[PDB]
């Protein structure tokens, strides 16, 4: 994981977007590619459709999800089974 | 005292350069220390010689950098000044240093 002294990581533009949504009080999904972005307290409640390489998959945020990153909840590979 | 560090790839050439500087020194001044041979640096290199793939196919080159330490104990007026006009043969990096 990242160093504690560096702080968390979140993409600036994504942070901005989150701030705007908070200001608005809207619940329309924000489509995003920043899979590397960590998740914050203020983003709880928002839906945020994270890119998985192919498509944006909606991620409704939860309290439990804070420390994690957005890409963790947007699996990229699609394996069903070998038979 | 003037330390002089001669460096070159060719050893005959460096030897020639050592001699010549020694002569330059000896005529003008007095008590040239001497042409001390330091260790040679044998920088080796391996490379694949195939254009695409044959890994055991290789060539191993090297460059032998030779060092000669020449020292002058008494810097006079005439002697140090000689060297300025007395340039050496090419491919021989000299390095003088007084004190």
């Amino acid at each position: 994981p990242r160093s504690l002294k560096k702080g968390p990581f979140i993409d600036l533009h994504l942070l901005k977007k989150v701030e705007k949504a908070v200001e608005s009080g809207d619940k329309k999904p924000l489509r995003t590619w920043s899979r590397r972005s960590t998740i914050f307290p203020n983003m709880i409640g928002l839906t945020i459709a994270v890119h998985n390489g192919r498509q944006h998959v909606p991620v409704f945020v939860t309290d439990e999800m804070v420390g994690h990153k957005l890409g963790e909840f947007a699996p990229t590979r699609t394996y069903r089974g070998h038979a | 005292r003037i330390r002089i560090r001669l460096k070159a790839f060719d050893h005959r050439l460096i030897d020639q350069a050592t001699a010549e500087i020694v002569e330059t020194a000896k005529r003008t001044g007095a008590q040239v220390r001497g042409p001390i041979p330091l260790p040679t640096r044998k920088e080796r290199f391996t490379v694949l010689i195939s254009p695409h793939v044959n890994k055991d196919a290789r060539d191993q080159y090297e460059i032998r950098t030779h060092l000669r330490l020449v020292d002058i104990v008494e810097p006079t007026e005439k002697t140090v000044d000689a060297l300025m006009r007395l340039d050496l043969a090419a491919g021989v990096d000299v390095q003088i240093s007084l004190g």
Partner: protein, 208 residues
């Protein structure tokens, strides 16, 4: 790729280096590139002039070139006219004060590189490669080579199936280190493709 390069194996004993200068690991690659650049330029310029060997030698932040060419005056042109022009562009290529010398090549038939160039030229102007090769070998021998070998490869006579052919005369010892084997190469960019020309010339054994 069986054989070792005849110059390369002999650089320590009987053959000398072309680029002859010293530095520290800092400035080497830069100077190597400078040498490449100048040499490339000179090849481009003095193509019509029969030039065999460019020798770069840079002491004291100043580059000294030495061009070994068979016919100097074409390189020199009018006395100190063409040489001067070359010098300034060389300086520009390097970024230092330049000094050009021109060595005059006695017996261009015995210089391997020149011979290869001539053969390449002949091939370009559509002669029988075989006849060019015989001319080369014969001339060298006439001039007093202890031996010569030449070899040409690929799309000979525009044939679909490429093949190589070579002609030796005299003695051309390659395993013998002390032998003076001037080796060089060239390429004919014909309509049908490239034709590679190698030539070895045995000027004799050195005793030391």
């Amino acid at each position: 790729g069986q054989k070792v390069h005849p110059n390369g194996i002999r650089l320590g004993i009987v053959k000398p280096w072309n680029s002859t200068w010293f530095a520290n690991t800092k400035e080497f690659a830069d100077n190597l590139d400078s040498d490449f650049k100048v040499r490339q330029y000179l090849t481009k310029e003095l193509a019509k002039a029969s030039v065999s060997r460019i020798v770069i030698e840079r002491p004291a932040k100043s580059i000294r070139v030495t061009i070994h060419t068979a016919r100097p005056g074409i390189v020199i042109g009018k006395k100190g006219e063409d040489v001067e022009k070359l010098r300034k562009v060389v300086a520009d290529i390097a970024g230092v004060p330049a000094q050009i010398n021109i060595a005059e090549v006695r017996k261009p038939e015995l210089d391997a590189k020149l011979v290869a160039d001539s053969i390449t030229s002949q091939l370009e102007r559509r002669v029988m490669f075989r006849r060019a090769m015989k001319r080369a070998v014969q001339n060298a021998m006439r001039l007093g080579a202890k031996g010569i070998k030449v070899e040409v490869s690929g799309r000979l006579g525009g044939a679909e199936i490429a093949r190589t052919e070579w002609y030796r005369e005299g003695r051309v010892p390659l395993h013998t280190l002390r032998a003076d084997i001037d080796y060089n190469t060239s390429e004919a960019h014909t309509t049908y493709g490239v034709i590679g020309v190698k030539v070895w010339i045995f000027k004799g054994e050195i005793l030391g």
